[PDB]
Amino acid sequence: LKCNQLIPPFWKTCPKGKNLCYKMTMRAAPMVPVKRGCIDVCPKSSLLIKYMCCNTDKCN
């Protein structure tokens, strides 16, 4: 279980439990990525920012 983050090849293996990952894009703009990392589940997404969480590698 591993996940790449914003744009370059930058990937890493996420630890047990945190087998999920994400990439928070800004809803202000269509979906401008700004944050990303290995998680468990998507934190409280805001009205102006969409947290794009998922379970598969590469997905964020």
What's the CATH number where 59 sits?
Answer: 2.10.60.10
- Classify the C-alpha dihedral 53-36-3-8 as positive or negative: positive
3-class DSSP assignment, residue 36: strand
Domain that includes residue 23, residue range: 1-60
Which amino acid type is present at position 43? P
Which among 59, 60, 52, 22 has a CA at the least distance from the CA of 40?
Answer: 22
**C-alpha to C-alpha distance for 11 and 54, rounded to whole angstroms:** 15
Q: Which long-range contacts (CB under 8 A, 24 or more apart) does 2-11 make?
A: 2/57, 3/38, 3/57, 3/58, 3/59, 3/60, 4/58, 4/60, 5/36, 5/37, 5/60, 6/33, 6/34, 6/36, 7/33, 11/57, 11/58
Domain count, the chain: 1
